[PDB]
């Protein structure tokens, strides 16, 4: 992911989900 500039605003606060979906 090359366009992960526009990912980052909201990967800090995904990330939390992150936990969860790759989880569950």
């Given at each position: 992911?090359?366009?992960k500039?526009?990912?980052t605003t909201i990967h800090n606060l995904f990330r939390k989900?992150?936990?969860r979906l790759f989880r569950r």
């Open positions: 992911w090359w366009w500039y526009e990912i989900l992150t936990h």
